[model samples]
Target: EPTCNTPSNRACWSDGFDINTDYEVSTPDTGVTQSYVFNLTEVDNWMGPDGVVKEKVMLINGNIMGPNIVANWGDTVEVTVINNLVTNGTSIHWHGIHQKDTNLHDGANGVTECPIPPKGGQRTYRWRARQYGTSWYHSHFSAQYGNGVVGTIQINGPASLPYDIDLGVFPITDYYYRAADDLVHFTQNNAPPFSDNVLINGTAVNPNTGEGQYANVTLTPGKRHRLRILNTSTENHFQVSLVNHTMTVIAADMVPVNAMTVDSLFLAVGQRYDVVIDASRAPDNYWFNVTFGGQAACGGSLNPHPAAIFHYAGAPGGLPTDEGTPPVDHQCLDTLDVRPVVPRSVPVNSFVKRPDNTLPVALDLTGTPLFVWKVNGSDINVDWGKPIIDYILTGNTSYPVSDNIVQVDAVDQWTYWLIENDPEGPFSLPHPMHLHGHDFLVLGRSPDVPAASQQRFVFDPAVDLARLNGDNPPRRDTTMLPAGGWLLLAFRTDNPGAWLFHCHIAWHVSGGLSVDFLERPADLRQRISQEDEDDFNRVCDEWRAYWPTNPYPKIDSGL
Candidate 1:
């Protein structure tokens, strides 16, 4: 942890493993996490995502995160995830899956168990694959999640679960970089005070190769396999696709839906897609890319390299399958009860278009451009200035929670809510908003109704909203707020905590798309140490050991 292992930060050990376990490391574009100094620390009896600290964990690196995950349909995954950093409570949340039900392997807090407190001990998580698909795992209680803390989870179910090939659950990693010592001690009030690099899976990458292009699986000529892809990036999005394949959508979010196909797809922050490709025509090589959705006004390069694919020797070539399967009986918005920590029904009671209301809760999620997540335009947590709680709670402006209790009460019961984009910016970036604990819903979307050029936004309504058939619009962990539009969604806030609401785009959330919405206990809101004051000079000295130049997100307000 301190550049090298010493007494301060012990080398991570697991399952009676040794401290000398070799680790291979390289900047993402060049090497893998396992390639360098790995196996950082170990936590034990770790808790779930819902409650406070209760278990111990092992953090592989200086953080509570892991590597680019890959798995088959029936492999029993018994990973010893730990938390090494001497930080506060640390726990994990397996985003999008039902931990309690499926295999009860869902990484969460309280519901299944408590969080692994700092300096705590180990928790053994074991599970069997009940379903096959893409998902992610991350810290349940820290903004550390926004701090590039999530990894990939790929589960392959029954082999009879038809498909040409399996998919990739690519977990992209990164840090909110700035001048080395400028601002390292970012607090709630302080936002993503820096925006210098995009580290994919623990390494910086070339946009051309695409971030998720790891562990390339060589294919047989004319053999079409399933490219089950997922964008587990910190906070970036990409226009993704393969060079010689037409990606067809056969199933979504682990449930079988319509057979949708396309040349390319827009992968928002926390979203996943199961695309079928007909690699009919074989070639020597092709690049699997995640072309930059590019930062225009910022003069950011659009087609930068993130990852790549160098084909094998004597690989086959030809046209892929032309099997035209009719659409299924279900709609894209249908729900699957296959494996659930808690079976949640679709459509939690929630809304945003009410004509009458009491109090107004106003928040400017645009403050400082620390990475990209901004609040009131600032990244400083303090700038959050008395959050529009009532506005967020009752969906009103005045006299307390106006009758929306039963609806927005995402507590013991399941609930839903919608958040819209204020139609601004040149194809203003869409944030992949996410709620911890329970996986929510993407109830409806507009007809990609159209935005800018070169980068124009077209918000297309996923399916016939009025006709709730399950044709599989788009399965989501990340919902792109259509250029300039609104998205309808609902979910149960069963898992309690000061649930974090932020953009999945690493930088943005780092910047400011962050907030701790209190549901289970309003008391924790009190835990928000109104004392995270800025000892800037002190912090600057501490981080200088890492980066020479000062460029961390500076906190203006003394907590």
Candidate 2:
């Protein structure tokens, strides 16, 4: 049997566990506070994963890749973001974090609050580590995170498995030489372009560009290593695998799942996984491969699959000459059956349909000058001076349903949403749909139905749908919407706030691909205190005062 230990504190991983015993849970953290000040800066001459010089890019604290913020569960995290970008604004959305009562600090610009002002502007994000596991913080305003503005957050909470040394955050992303704004413009004009390289912890070789970079990992033999893998790609889905090692996956998106071993792990955009690997393999060098797998049909010619070197102590310094082949799973799909750890069972949703009868919206794309994706025939557009929260806070009841907002009235009840792509809509691509306030239960999905419209849906409760994963179904903050298919998502309307559920693709988001859930607004009237309302007004006033001098550009995509 395998054992685990943490390098800093071996006692951290030694809580009522021994050889031949499978039960081990990490001890809770001693109450302490963690703070950080992040400076968002833009620069030219950024370097790629392969050491090739990237012309222009964004940087956090002078590094091309942003740094990780690690803390224990229950610890208060306070980060002061100083926006030094001379041209653009910034906001960091903590993906998969249930903001609870701190919805104002959700960091979703234009939806939760205005983007932090650029050019010496500063904003402080204060929140507690509500949940423990692995997640990421990325800029939510426009395509900034694609340029850089990305990092990892590890809330040191309970873990199902243990490891010797907890290897820190590893952010895997796709790299482009040009700025994200340029890519956004290109997406508005032509088909989506493949990135130059897949950046694994900021290293990869571009075979087309003839330059190389490697994420070098050296470990001691006969030890356990916990690797937190995060796929922060814009449009690339990577299949990660070790050349000669099998990984025991313990968690996904900060939510611990039952221990499952696999040869390779398929990760879509905005997804995270924590895997424990035994470094007991013969003391030799191996390959750490992350192959691009999202676009396989029409993107067959794309090359330079990003990879790294996994070396053990006493191994040669040179790269492994023959690192063998990786798994050949090219389609963009999740590889694991994410079963929650015991005692975290969700409430069973009784056979009840929404009273509003507004769900099962069609995911349609319109406009020819620039393609625009929409939920239920309306593109998501909002004004900073009048956010939905502020509008509803005025005690006014006359809110129109003509815009991109979806009103959910069922308080603490299950709301099932059927989101399907328009059968006649041009382009066949998958979107990684993400919800803001809750972790949705993926009930079921259907195959590609070209003629599948609302009338085609069978709503009979007893025998309407196929099989539902109701028996401890996998609950995640983000799930994939297969191309030309439908995703049946169900979530309890528990959290109160204006939450945005939309595609995680930066391009699609820029093209107005989103829907806001006004979850139990009446309940929010009590949750959002006067202090939060005052703070929201103060930020809006500041942005409004600075709007004249630095006006936001009116791109085709209203985001």
Q: Which regions of candidate 1 fall more than 4 Å away from where they truly are?
A: 1-81, 86-89, 100-131, 140-149, 158-161, 164-168, 172-217, 251-256, 294-303, 310-352, 355-416, 423-429, 446-475, 492-501, 508-559
Error in Å for residue 75 of model 2 = 0.8
How does model 2 score by TM-score?
A: 0.88
Model 1 RMSD to the real structure? 14.8
Write out the backbone clash pairs for model 2.
Answer: 5-163, 49-203, 49-204, 50-212, 50-213
- Residues 1-559, model 1: lDDT tens digits: 1123222222222222212221111101211122122233544444322122324444556354566454443344555554444533344556655432221234433222333433423344554433445776665432445443467676543221235445354443333332111332343235333223334333444333332223344655565566656655444454555666567764444433345666666555566666666656655566555454333211122223444452533754322223222222111112221122112245322233442211111234344432333333333242121223222322343422211222233345534343445444433544556654344456664434323322332223333345222222333344554444455555444443334455554434434454444454442233222221122112222323322222333332211
Task: Give all TM-scores, in the order shown.
Answer: 0.55, 0.88
Model 2, CA-based lDDT: 0.71
Worst 10 residues of 1 by lDDT: 23-32
Error of 2 at 451 (Å): 18
Candidate 2 per-residue lDDT, tens place, 341-448, comes to 742234334544453433333434345535666677766766654567777678875544433678887878777787765544444566778888677777766543
**Local error of candidate 1 at 302, Å?**
8.4
The 0-to-1 C-alpha lDDT of every candidate, in the order given, reads: 0.40, 0.71
